[PDB]
């Protein structure tokens, strides 16, 4: 899900939400995707 841009708030904190808004939910920025796509793009060319 993290590669598909989905952040589970229960995975990075103990939650004391379910509505899709930033005042209580968190934006995910996909900085792990570009790293993986180099290595699969290299494997395409090997």
């Amino acid at each position: 899900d993290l590669l598909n841009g989905r952040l589970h708030m229960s995975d990075l904190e103990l939650v004391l939400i379910k509505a899709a808004y930033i005042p209580d939910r968190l934006q995910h920025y996909p900085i792990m995707n570009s790293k993986l796509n180099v290595l699969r793009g290299e494997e395409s060319k090997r």
Binding site: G5, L7, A20, Y21, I22, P23, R25, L26, Q27, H28
Partner: protein
């Protein structure tokens, strides 16, 4: 304001003044005038009663309510769109836009010829008698008491019946309580700092709150997750 404005009659300020034996010639009539001078000079918008009236404009003119002291907004009745202000020098005058209003006396001067307008305004709260009604706030009450004690002692100092040290103490003590009374009525409650929080923190800035009655001013700004 943090505390609620519970209303009491004007003679509650006279129990407090006539504890002072030099203020024993004070009246209700003197307490009425010095209250309205004090209420005005502080300019606290929490002391006034918010009212809304619909008046009809005949030709760029409408008759304003009798109790009106300050207009909050004027808006149109059919649209709800608010009117800003008349800067035109030649308004209802023909030769050979965004609507506006202008108020001088008991007449409002609008930019629209034949229309009904809602006016949200402030008045003074009255009694069973047609007399002012003051907050029971012991900060308001103390500094209204020190206001009248400073106006009465200023007369007595001109007469030569008060020491200059006595008037200097009253002028100092009124000067402190007048700032404490200002901050008591101005500094927001927890529930007004939340609406101030939502106006202040806005990723897409909301810059058209006058068009509504500032209704969505303190509304929270939400951002979708993507």
């Amino acid at each position: 304001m943090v505390n609620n404005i519970n209303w009491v009659k004007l003679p509650v300020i006279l129990d407090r003044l006539l504890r002072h034996p030099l203020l024993t010639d004070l009246n209700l009539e003197t307490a009425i005038q010095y209250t309205l001078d004090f209420i005005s000079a502080m300019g606290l918008p929490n002391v006034y009663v918010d009212k809304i009236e619909t008046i009809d404009i005949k030709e760029y003119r409408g008759e304003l309510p009798c109790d009106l002291i300050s207009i909050n907004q004027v808006r149109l009745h059919k649209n709800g769109i608010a009117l800003r202000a008349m800067t035109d020098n030649f308004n209802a005058y023909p030769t050979h836009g965004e609507p506006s209003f202008k108020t001088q006396g008991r007449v409002i001067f609008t930019s629209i010829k034949h229309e009904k307008v809602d006016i949200s305004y402030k008045a003074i709260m009255l009694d069973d008698e047609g007399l002012p009604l003051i907050p029971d706030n012991p900060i308001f009450l103390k500094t209204l008491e020190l206001y009248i004690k400073k106006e009465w002692f200023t007369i007595l100092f001109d007469m030569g019946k008060i020491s200059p040290a006595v008037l200097n103490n009253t002028q100092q003590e009124y000067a402190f309580k007048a700032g404490q009374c200002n901050n008591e009525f101005v500094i927001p409650s927890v529930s007004e700092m939340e609406a101030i929080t939502n106006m202040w923190n806005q990723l897409i800035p909301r810059v058209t709150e006058f068009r509504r009655g500032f209704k969505n001013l303190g509304d929270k700004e939400y951002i979708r997750v993507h």
